[PDB]
Amino acid sequence: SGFRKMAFPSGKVEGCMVQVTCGTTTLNGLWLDDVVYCPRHVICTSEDMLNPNYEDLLIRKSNHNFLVQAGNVQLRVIGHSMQNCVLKLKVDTANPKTPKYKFVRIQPGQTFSVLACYNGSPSGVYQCAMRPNFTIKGSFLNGSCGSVGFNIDYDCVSFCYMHHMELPTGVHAGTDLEGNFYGPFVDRQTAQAAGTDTTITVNVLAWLYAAVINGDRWFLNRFTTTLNDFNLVAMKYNYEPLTQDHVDILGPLSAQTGIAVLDMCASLKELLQNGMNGRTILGSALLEDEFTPFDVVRQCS
Amino acid sequence: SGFRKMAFPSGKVEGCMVQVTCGTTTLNGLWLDDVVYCPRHVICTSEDMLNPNYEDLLIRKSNHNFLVQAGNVQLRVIGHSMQNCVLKLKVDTANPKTPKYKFVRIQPGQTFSVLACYNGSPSGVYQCAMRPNFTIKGSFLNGSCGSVGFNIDYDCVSFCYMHHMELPTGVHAGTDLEGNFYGPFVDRQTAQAAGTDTTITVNVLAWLYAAVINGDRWFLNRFTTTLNDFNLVAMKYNYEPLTQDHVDILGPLSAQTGIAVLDMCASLKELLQNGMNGRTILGSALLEDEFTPFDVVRQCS
Ligand SMILES: *[C@H](S)C(=O)c1cccc(C(=O)N[C@@H](Cc2ccccc2)C(=O)OC)c1
Ligand SMILES: *[C@H](S)C(=O)c1cccc(C(=O)N[C@@H](Cc2ccccc2)C(=O)OC)c1
């Protein structure tokens, strides 16, 4: 019993984190096989961040300008190249702790674990969701860029995020491991801002199923709704539309609890229109949208 | 920026988890140096749980009755003994991955990370607080006992909790690593239940300081209160009394934000008496009490 925001065990990732320094900028990197991946912003100067041409900045660097430290061991850089907004530093030692891994780009509404690191040293692990507006609500301080996000399946680490920056509202933006940004953000100084966001409906329904599995039933009712009538309500409250694929994905949890998906949608409509009237669900007084159907099944089996 | 429930990186702990089997009962154990620690309930049968005499049950066992598996490698048990409610299995191999460690008993109101495991395999990591009533609000399924809780300082793992059971309200009980239970709970079948709980006031104030550090200020006011008048309000709302030691511990966060502790207590009094009026703090619509002053300082530096 119980339901917590649970991250994947981080050991496999911890054995990949290193420190990368170029001039006076120090950040984190990810060491897999004989390559270290890190944000290309490591090569910038403070006065470069105004429309830096990164191809020019990199051509002016050599291998010896990159100091890579893994624990207390310096790794010799023997090649460098850029891929989109990430730097690839070839080193002369393959990481003996490389896990099986994949680089996978995630979708908005999917969750992942973040290993926050400073100076190549892991500090904390937590779960995050990619928001519909392609930001994440992380916890990151100066020095955390290059920290990565990941999911683990069997023994395979699927890396999905590399941290780059903080936007003015305090939310975070970064790229995939191929160096392509999530969202309409860039690694330079502009007035860029998070766009409007929405609530991830299918995840809210998944979490209501978690609550039922864990004994919270007060919000249930005998009603059902149609998908169309539900989505009229969703649109009014800035919730994403619910698709038949979403309904299908909720199939297992509906079968486990015996509560039809459209039946649970009637409960969600009531909660949106009426609020909670002083009650809580799974220890929250708000509707939670950062757990996917998979997250619920994994934790509530 | 940002504020998340953050756990410690779990790799050091992961390298200590093993599977312990006795007869048909399988659970997790913690392998440090040449000893494996696990709940003594592993030696019980289903019909033993009615007032089992564990000294009799253990005398009837031999080393070969314990199967310890670390990954895919069986460890030979060469001695067994009981310490309070934990079993100590001496094995013929020292764990090469033993971290520096300590066994430390925590107090109610302190937090720790839990590495939930099944069949000696880590599944997830999350943060928990020891409640005033000595339970924890975990997330644990059948097979998770022997999973441990811990804090990490520098390179030293301080183990503080070993999971044993779930109480009827869905909250969890266990022991320290010396096998002594937290709270008035026992490892046998009874009608035992969690006692009345309270809210951890000093942690709520720590979290209000985190919110201010992160830009949430709407709950601030120009008022102050005395400690006595505040504690009259705390008692009414089932909050723990605030001591001068608590005030002292909040000293750094008060200095960082410029908000006196008693000043913040006036805000908390207003929130308790008036509620939130539709607003949120750090993404919550309830007052959060599972972050200690130390947790805030570590994450909000
Ligand atoms: C480090 S988390 C990183 O990868 C990164 C990516 C994009 C932008 C920034 C960043 O902080 N830029 C600042 C300017 C700067 C910082 C450090 C060295 C040189 C220049 C900035 O002004 O935006 C916040 C970091
Ligand atoms: C496993 S998490 C463990 O250590 C433990 C400690 C105390 C009590 C129990 C427990 O589940 N007892 C049940 C009976 C039982 C289970 C398994 C084998 C033998 C007997 C019980 O009835 O209480 C929930 C487990």
XYZ file of C-alpha atoms and ligand atoms in Angstrom:
652
model
C 0.000 0.000 0.000
C 0.957 3.616 -0.311
C 1.739 5.874 -3.241
C 4.799 8.039 -3.494
C 6.577 9.962 -6.221
C 9.187 7.230 -6.796
C 12.320 7.535 -8.830
C 14.324 4.725 -10.419
C 17.385 3.522 -8.424
C 20.169 5.805 -9.614
C 23.326 3.668 -9.222
C 23.649 2.871 -12.905
C 23.586 6.531 -13.713
C 25.845 7.569 -10.890
C 28.640 5.525 -12.329
C 28.476 7.631 -15.512
C 28.661 11.154 -14.083
C 31.866 13.200 -14.567
C 32.929 16.843 -14.298
C 33.780 18.806 -17.469
C 35.701 22.097 -17.254
C 36.531 24.520 -20.086
C 38.287 27.723 -19.081
C 36.452 28.858 -15.989
C 33.171 27.064 -16.659
C 32.577 23.786 -14.879
C 29.503 21.490 -15.449
C 28.483 17.874 -15.513
C 28.977 15.300 -18.183
C 27.759 11.773 -18.953
C 30.486 9.199 -19.655
C 29.351 6.200 -21.722
C 31.854 3.907 -23.474
C 34.679 6.263 -24.550
C 32.525 9.424 -25.026
C 31.570 12.175 -22.556
C 28.360 14.087 -23.411
C 27.785 17.559 -22.001
C 26.025 20.873 -22.842
C 27.848 22.781 -25.521
C 27.435 25.950 -23.376
C 30.598 24.777 -21.561
C 32.640 26.445 -24.271
C 31.057 29.799 -23.922
C 32.375 32.830 -22.108
C 30.054 35.096 -20.183
C 30.127 37.701 -23.016
C 29.600 35.000 -25.655
C 25.971 34.313 -24.654
C 24.705 37.052 -26.942
C 24.250 35.217 -30.145
C 27.254 32.983 -29.935
C 28.237 31.168 -33.062
C 29.085 27.796 -31.516
C 30.800 26.487 -34.661
C 33.287 29.373 -34.401
C 33.691 28.950 -30.656
C 34.466 25.236 -31.036
C 36.913 25.609 -33.900
C 38.992 27.810 -31.593
C 39.269 25.027 -28.959
C 41.597 21.987 -28.846
C 41.371 18.731 -26.857
C 43.646 20.099 -24.108
C 41.175 22.850 -23.364
C 38.712 20.272 -21.869
C 39.450 18.878 -18.382
C 37.341 15.799 -17.657
C 37.457 14.342 -14.151
C 35.804 11.092 -13.106
C 35.984 10.921 -9.326
C 39.628 11.628 -8.693
C 40.886 10.395 -12.065
C 41.484 12.720 -14.983
C 40.371 11.357 -18.375
C 42.397 12.405 -21.373
C 40.291 14.015 -24.143
C 41.386 12.772 -27.577
C 38.663 14.249 -29.745
C 35.846 16.757 -29.641
C 32.802 17.440 -31.772
C 29.385 19.111 -31.586
C 26.035 17.446 -32.075
C 23.233 20.006 -31.996
C 23.398 21.511 -28.493
C 25.563 18.816 -26.923
C 29.319 18.358 -27.021
C 30.835 14.930 -27.567
C 34.287 14.533 -25.976
C 36.080 11.361 -26.993
C 38.308 10.110 -24.141
C 41.006 7.500 -24.107
C 39.251 5.243 -21.570
C 35.958 3.427 -21.938
C 33.847 3.784 -18.781
C 33.977 0.323 -17.149
C 30.668 1.109 -15.471
C 28.737 1.773 -18.679
C 25.266 0.222 -18.351
C 23.245 -1.033 -21.230
C 21.679 2.139 -22.512
C 19.592 3.871 -25.159
C 19.023 7.524 -26.092
C 15.214 8.007 -26.303
C 13.293 11.158 -26.757
C 10.202 11.395 -24.640
C 6.846 12.890 -25.167
C 5.026 15.518 -23.115
C 3.077 13.811 -20.345
C 5.780 11.119 -19.815
C 7.787 10.873 -16.599
C 11.468 10.263 -15.864
C 13.944 10.317 -12.963
C 16.462 13.143 -12.649
C 19.861 12.661 -10.998
C 20.815 16.153 -9.925
C 24.586 16.565 -9.858
C 27.124 19.259 -9.063
C 30.826 19.134 -10.068
C 30.254 15.609 -11.422
C 29.012 14.455 -7.961
C 25.413 13.161 -7.618
C 23.357 15.060 -5.079
C 19.760 13.815 -5.244
C 17.254 11.860 -7.305
C 13.633 12.768 -8.037
C 10.810 12.149 -10.500
C 9.757 14.731 -13.081
C 7.260 14.868 -15.936
C 7.752 16.564 -19.266
C 5.009 19.171 -19.304
C 2.787 19.786 -22.322
C 4.754 23.019 -22.840
C 8.067 21.046 -22.947
C 9.416 22.374 -19.695
C 10.074 20.417 -16.566
C 9.424 21.492 -12.969
C 12.774 20.395 -11.603
C 14.974 21.311 -8.736
C 18.280 22.569 -9.995
C 20.817 25.076 -8.720
C 23.757 26.709 -10.432
C 26.189 24.039 -11.523
C 23.570 21.430 -12.288
C 23.586 21.599 -16.022
C 24.556 18.365 -17.667
C 22.557 16.481 -15.108
C 20.465 13.842 -16.857
C 16.954 12.349 -16.810
C 16.314 8.677 -17.467
C 14.024 5.666 -17.145
C 15.238 2.139 -16.478
C 13.643 -0.998 -17.947
C 15.121 -4.315 -16.998
C 18.784 -3.503 -16.985
C 18.693 -0.841 -19.731
C 18.962 2.866 -18.976
C 16.989 4.985 -21.485
C 18.436 8.477 -21.195
C 15.936 11.116 -22.220
C 17.031 14.469 -20.848
C 20.075 16.632 -20.322
C 19.681 19.778 -18.298
C 20.632 23.135 -19.812
C 18.857 26.068 -18.220
C 16.266 27.716 -16.040
C 13.536 29.936 -17.523
C 12.205 33.061 -15.822
C 9.271 31.300 -14.096
C 11.684 28.909 -12.383
C 10.946 25.943 -14.635
C 13.640 24.129 -16.582
C 14.555 23.375 -20.147
C 16.966 21.002 -21.804
C 17.585 18.623 -24.573
C 17.517 15.029 -25.507
C 20.841 13.157 -25.611
C 21.222 13.976 -29.279
C 21.346 17.628 -28.241
C 17.938 18.616 -29.561
C 15.939 20.860 -27.295
C 12.592 19.932 -25.916
C 10.414 22.860 -26.817
C 11.016 26.192 -28.490
C 14.078 27.066 -26.366
C 17.663 27.934 -27.217
C 20.978 27.930 -25.438
C 21.605 31.616 -25.506
C 20.316 34.672 -23.681
C 16.906 35.806 -24.918
C 13.604 36.738 -23.388
C 12.341 33.236 -24.028
C 9.629 32.077 -21.659
C 7.564 28.990 -20.970
C 4.404 28.962 -23.040
C 0.962 28.244 -21.691
C 0.665 24.835 -20.082
C -2.206 22.372 -19.547
C -2.988 19.501 -17.184
C -2.239 15.949 -18.319
C -5.735 14.398 -18.135
C -4.816 10.755 -18.691
C -2.311 10.972 -15.813
C -4.896 12.510 -13.483
C -7.199 9.572 -14.258
C -4.317 7.139 -13.660
C -3.744 8.705 -10.257
C -7.449 8.497 -9.370
C -7.135 4.758 -10.091
C -4.076 4.596 -7.832
C -6.154 6.239 -5.132
C -8.934 3.696 -5.481
C -6.393 0.826 -5.406
C -5.115 2.361 -2.177
C -8.523 2.787 -0.601
C -9.576 6.380 -1.348
C -13.139 6.064 -2.768
C -15.028 9.173 -1.634
C -14.896 10.795 -5.066
C -16.552 7.818 -6.828
C -20.112 8.107 -8.063
C -22.693 5.981 -9.863
C -22.612 8.188 -13.000
C -20.942 7.791 -16.308
C -20.223 10.275 -19.047
C -19.589 10.193 -22.743
C -16.101 10.946 -24.015
C -17.435 14.033 -25.899
C -19.241 15.470 -22.841
C -16.159 14.827 -20.728
C -13.896 16.606 -23.221
C -16.201 19.634 -23.220
C -15.541 19.813 -19.490
C -11.808 19.178 -19.930
C -11.496 22.065 -22.361
C -13.179 24.434 -19.917
C -10.651 23.655 -17.132
C -7.481 23.703 -19.282
C -7.127 19.875 -19.327
C -5.854 18.053 -22.405
C -8.471 16.238 -24.443
C -8.876 12.555 -23.644
C -8.517 10.248 -26.644
C -9.761 6.732 -27.177
C -6.098 5.705 -27.041
C -5.933 7.147 -23.532
C -9.061 5.148 -22.611
C -7.388 2.024 -24.014
C -4.187 2.684 -22.035
C -6.269 2.932 -18.849
C -7.771 -0.453 -19.625
C -5.722 -2.507 -17.117
C -6.380 -0.136 -14.204
C -10.098 -0.024 -15.054
C -10.200 -3.826 -15.075
C -8.287 -4.095 -11.805
C -10.617 -1.711 -9.959
C -13.797 -2.559 -11.796
C -14.427 1.138 -12.513
C -15.029 1.907 -16.173
C -12.863 4.688 -17.642
C -15.868 6.829 -18.511
C -17.167 6.216 -15.032
C -13.968 7.603 -13.585
C -14.240 10.490 -16.011
C -17.614 11.360 -14.430
C -15.813 11.527 -11.071
C -13.120 13.781 -12.492
C -15.799 16.075 -13.980
C -17.377 16.350 -10.520
C -13.997 17.138 -8.898
C -13.261 19.846 -11.467
C -16.667 21.483 -11.083
C -17.024 21.120 -7.294
C -13.547 20.931 -5.856
C -12.572 18.689 -2.990
C -14.760 20.131 -0.150
C -11.934 19.771 2.360
C -10.942 16.201 1.494
C -7.663 14.811 0.112
C -6.711 12.067 -2.347
C -3.449 10.150 -1.785
C -2.443 12.882 0.612
C -2.953 15.697 -1.904
C -5.541 18.495 -2.001
C -4.971 19.044 -5.752
C -5.439 16.751 -8.729
C -2.042 15.249 -9.534
C -0.908 14.847 -13.107
C 2.677 13.645 -12.915
C 2.031 9.891 -12.716
C 1.473 7.966 -15.932
C -0.673 4.823 -16.184
C 2.587 2.874 -16.275
C 3.878 4.564 -13.121
C 0.667 3.544 -11.321
C 0.754 -0.032 -12.467
C 4.444 -0.342 -11.479
C 3.916 0.953 -8.019
C 0.422 -0.346 -7.233
C 0.686 -3.941 -8.458
C 15.103 27.031 -8.344
C 12.426 24.486 -7.677
C 11.620 22.243 -4.742
C 11.026 18.542 -5.001
C 10.850 15.622 -2.605
C 14.433 14.497 -3.314
C 16.004 11.263 -2.254
C 19.708 10.519 -1.847
C 21.396 8.765 -4.827
C 20.861 5.082 -4.103
C 23.864 3.383 -5.771
C 25.753 2.802 -2.547
C 22.776 1.036 -1.109
C 21.954 -0.897 -4.229
C 25.262 -2.654 -4.055
C 24.286 -4.049 -0.636
C 20.879 -5.566 -1.397
C 20.513 -9.380 -1.501
C 17.687 -11.926 -1.406
C 17.236 -14.137 1.682
C 15.072 -17.278 1.518
C 14.114 -19.620 4.377
C 11.734 -22.435 3.501
C 9.120 -20.799 1.331
C 9.570 -17.243 2.588
C 11.672 -14.904 0.495
C 12.612 -11.279 1.507
C 15.373 -8.747 1.210
C 18.583 -8.480 3.113
C 21.391 -5.943 3.554
C 24.921 -7.264 2.959
C 27.678 -5.275 4.690
C 31.178 -6.720 5.198
C 30.563 -10.453 5.816
C 27.092 -10.112 7.457
C 23.602 -10.094 5.908
C 20.908 -8.330 7.987
C 17.248 -9.165 7.454
C 13.907 -9.302 9.353
C 13.747 -12.246 11.687
C 10.203 -12.951 10.362
C 11.957 -14.840 7.528
C 12.102 -17.870 9.785
C 8.452 -17.965 10.521
C 5.813 -20.173 8.980
C 2.358 -18.843 8.252
C 0.941 -20.611 11.364
C 3.847 -19.391 13.509
C 2.711 -15.737 13.496
C 0.486 -16.302 16.508
C 2.830 -15.644 19.319
C 5.909 -17.198 17.849
C 8.786 -17.786 20.176
C 11.611 -16.701 17.868
C 14.344 -18.162 20.092
C 12.746 -21.602 19.648
C 12.190 -21.083 15.934
C 15.841 -20.126 15.397
C 17.320 -22.944 17.447
C 15.564 -25.345 15.073
C 17.333 -23.837 12.015
C 20.873 -24.450 10.686
C 23.041 -22.404 8.295
C 21.959 -24.515 5.298
C 18.366 -23.489 5.811
C 19.196 -19.895 4.654
C 19.694 -19.270 0.912
C 21.325 -15.894 0.285
C 21.623 -14.695 -3.306
C 23.492 -11.579 -4.396
C 22.618 -10.976 -8.032
C 23.269 -14.358 -9.555
C 25.819 -15.496 -6.972
C 24.878 -17.608 -3.983
C 26.605 -16.626 -0.719
C 27.368 -19.411 1.702
C 25.930 -18.815 5.206
C 28.443 -19.817 7.892
C 26.701 -18.515 10.986
C 23.367 -17.192 12.156
C 22.178 -15.240 15.164
C 19.310 -12.997 16.281
C 19.568 -9.407 17.410
C 16.202 -8.126 18.610
C 13.943 -8.327 15.541
C 16.696 -8.695 12.952
C 18.617 -11.772 11.873
C 22.363 -11.620 11.329
C 23.621 -14.156 8.761
C 27.391 -14.448 8.626
C 28.539 -15.299 5.074
C 31.875 -16.447 3.790
C 32.407 -13.428 1.507
C 32.784 -9.795 2.478
C 30.718 -7.553 0.188
C 33.310 -5.786 -2.009
C 30.823 -2.963 -2.486
C 30.406 -2.165 1.209
C 30.280 1.626 1.626
C 31.401 3.441 4.691
C 28.389 3.120 6.922
C 26.817 3.666 10.327
C 23.681 2.320 12.029
C 21.807 5.376 13.417
C 18.431 5.524 14.969
C 16.381 8.488 13.917
C 13.897 10.629 15.654
C 10.291 11.380 14.727
C 10.199 14.358 12.379
C 13.464 13.333 10.613
C 13.546 12.279 6.964
C 15.328 9.487 5.097
C 15.426 7.830 1.662
C 13.877 4.401 1.148
C 15.171 1.961 -1.476
C 12.200 -0.275 -2.131
C 13.323 -3.735 -3.212
C 11.757 -7.035 -4.209
C 13.631 -10.381 -4.359
C 16.864 -8.513 -3.557
C 16.371 -6.279 -6.658
C 15.966 -2.492 -6.172
C 12.759 -1.114 -7.619
C 12.460 2.558 -6.648
C 13.762 5.262 -4.337
C 11.742 7.867 -2.436
C 11.871 10.164 0.585
C 9.952 9.432 3.782
C 9.665 11.028 7.214
C 9.350 9.222 10.508
C 6.000 10.409 11.808
C 5.455 11.518 15.400
C 3.573 8.231 15.900
C 6.641 6.231 14.685
C 5.079 5.036 11.477
C 6.138 5.924 7.992
C 3.901 6.646 4.993
C 5.794 4.479 2.541
C 5.042 2.662 -0.627
C 5.626 -1.020 -0.174
C 4.084 -4.146 -1.654
C 4.329 -7.763 -0.603
C 7.937 -8.853 -0.764
C 9.387 -5.517 0.244
C 10.328 -6.281 3.779
C 14.006 -5.941 4.462
C 14.109 -2.877 2.295
C 16.081 -0.163 4.070
C 15.970 3.585 4.772
C 19.102 5.706 4.913
C 20.719 9.136 4.731
C 24.078 9.815 3.116
C 26.599 12.375 4.393
C 29.800 12.779 2.475
C 30.547 9.221 1.548
C 28.989 7.586 4.636
C 25.650 5.790 4.517
C 23.747 6.085 7.829
C 21.200 3.278 7.767
C 18.205 4.061 9.931
C 15.324 1.819 8.928
C 14.501 -1.726 7.943
C 11.019 -2.459 6.722
C 8.914 -5.098 8.475
C 5.193 -4.609 8.021
C 2.096 -2.714 7.021
C -0.493 -1.622 9.605
C -4.236 -1.588 8.955
C -4.370 2.083 7.866
C -1.825 1.388 5.125
C 1.116 2.982 6.921
C 4.330 1.116 7.644
C 6.384 0.023 10.593
C 9.888 -1.289 11.025
C 13.008 -1.238 13.018
C 16.380 0.299 13.268
C 19.363 -1.756 12.065
C 19.863 -3.124 15.550
C 16.433 -4.717 15.197
C 14.599 -2.441 17.604
C 11.194 -1.320 16.457
C 10.271 2.267 15.963
C 7.116 2.659 17.970
C 4.940 0.308 19.969
C 4.782 -2.375 17.243
C 5.700 -6.046 17.161
C 6.507 -8.609 14.528
C 3.568 -10.856 15.075
C -0.134 -10.804 14.284
C -2.120 -8.578 16.639
C -4.688 -5.854 16.326
C -1.957 -3.267 16.661
C -2.713 0.052 15.011
C -1.048 3.387 14.405
C -1.681 5.778 17.261
C -2.817 9.346 16.860
C -0.434 11.456 14.820
C 0.413 15.180 14.704
C 1.916 17.602 12.191
C 5.635 18.371 12.400
C 5.541 22.158 12.961
C 9.239 22.926 12.560
C 9.212 21.166 9.168
C 6.170 23.131 8.004
C 8.036 26.342 8.870
C 11.128 25.056 7.034
C 9.007 24.454 3.952
C 7.456 27.934 4.154
C 11.045 29.242 4.066
C 11.749 27.061 1.027
C 8.709 28.605 -0.613
C 9.918 32.126 0.063
C 13.406 31.242 -1.262
C 11.643 30.009 -4.390
C 9.459 33.065 -4.808
C 6.129 32.202 -3.152
C 5.397 35.192 -0.843
C 1.610 35.617 -0.801
C 1.246 34.140 2.680
C 3.689 36.627 4.279
C 2.378 39.371 6.523
C 3.723 42.266 8.579
C 2.743 40.620 11.903
C 4.711 38.751 14.457
C 3.628 36.493 17.271
C 5.023 35.313 20.546
C 6.124 31.702 20.868
C 3.451 31.109 23.582
C 0.596 32.575 21.489
C 1.770 30.568 18.495
C 1.844 27.334 20.503
C -1.709 27.953 21.717
C -2.683 27.970 18.051
C -0.517 24.932 17.269
C -2.201 22.900 19.984
C -5.642 23.720 18.602
C -4.764 22.379 15.112
C -2.922 19.210 16.222
C 0.565 20.647 15.473
C 3.549 19.818 17.668
C 4.678 22.559 20.015
C 7.491 24.743 18.717
C 10.511 24.946 21.016
C 13.231 27.542 21.243
C 15.544 24.849 19.869
C 13.337 24.678 16.783
C 13.566 28.482 16.463
C 17.357 28.203 16.734
C 17.483 25.472 14.065
C 15.516 27.745 11.718
C 18.090 30.463 12.272
C 19.966 30.073 8.951
C 16.796 30.085 6.830
C 15.466 33.117 8.727
C 18.741 34.943 8.090
C 18.789 33.990 4.414
C 15.252 35.260 3.784
C 15.257 38.085 6.279
C 11.996 36.811 7.802
C 12.147 36.323 11.555
C 11.014 32.899 12.810
C 8.205 34.377 14.884
C 7.215 36.416 11.879
C 6.861 33.257 9.843
C 4.942 31.735 12.723
C 2.385 34.558 12.371
C 1.983 33.520 8.721
C 1.504 29.887 9.684
C -1.128 30.900 12.272
C -2.997 32.772 9.527
C -2.807 29.761 7.165
C -4.128 27.418 9.855
C -7.019 29.702 10.776
C -7.943 30.862 7.253
C -6.812 28.181 4.860
C -5.302 28.876 1.479
C -8.251 30.632 -0.296
C -7.540 28.791 -3.539
C -3.787 29.406 -3.656
C -0.872 26.939 -3.558
C 2.608 26.923 -2.018
C 5.412 25.063 -3.836
C 2.740 23.369 -5.889
C 0.815 22.070 -2.868
C -2.622 23.023 -1.523
C -1.787 21.599 1.938
C 0.886 22.519 4.458
C 3.778 20.105 3.960
C 5.614 18.658 6.917
C 8.032 16.123 5.481
C 10.984 18.439 4.804
C 13.369 19.227 7.642
C 15.325 22.490 7.933
C 18.345 20.527 6.722
C 16.474 19.199 3.689
C 15.563 22.786 2.743
C 19.042 24.140 3.151
C 20.494 21.249 1.097
C 18.155 21.740 -1.769
C 17.667 25.517 -1.730
C 21.256 26.713 -1.304
C 24.751 25.051 -17.686
S 23.356 24.451 -16.684
C 24.450 25.108 -19.240
O 24.528 24.198 -19.948
C 23.786 26.277 -19.908
C 23.041 26.146 -21.081
C 22.398 27.304 -21.561
C 22.493 28.538 -20.886
C 23.216 28.604 -19.695
C 23.450 29.851 -18.844
O 23.449 29.829 -17.648
N 23.775 31.079 -19.498
C 24.028 32.211 -18.631
C 25.327 32.913 -19.069
C 26.652 32.151 -18.846
C 26.799 31.265 -17.778
C 28.003 30.590 -17.579
C 29.076 30.791 -18.446
C 28.939 31.676 -19.515
C 27.735 32.352 -19.709
C 22.780 33.095 -18.698
O 22.908 34.281 -18.680
O 21.493 32.509 -18.805
C 20.906 32.089 -17.596
C 23.838 27.476 -19.225
C 8.269 -9.177 5.629
S 7.946 -7.507 4.982
C 8.550 -9.221 7.187
O 9.578 -9.000 7.666
C 7.462 -9.299 8.218
C 7.619 -8.802 9.513
C 6.494 -8.859 10.359
C 5.262 -9.386 9.920
C 5.148 -9.830 8.602
C 3.909 -10.452 7.960
O 3.581 -10.225 6.832
N 3.159 -11.415 8.702
C 2.023 -11.997 8.018
C 2.055 -13.528 8.180
C 3.182 -14.292 7.449
C 3.702 -13.822 6.243
C 4.711 -14.525 5.585
C 5.214 -15.707 6.126
C 4.699 -16.186 7.330
C 3.687 -15.483 7.983
C 0.776 -11.327 8.603
O -0.210 -11.978 8.762
O 0.805 -9.958 8.969
C 0.586 -9.037 7.927
C 6.240 -9.770 7.778
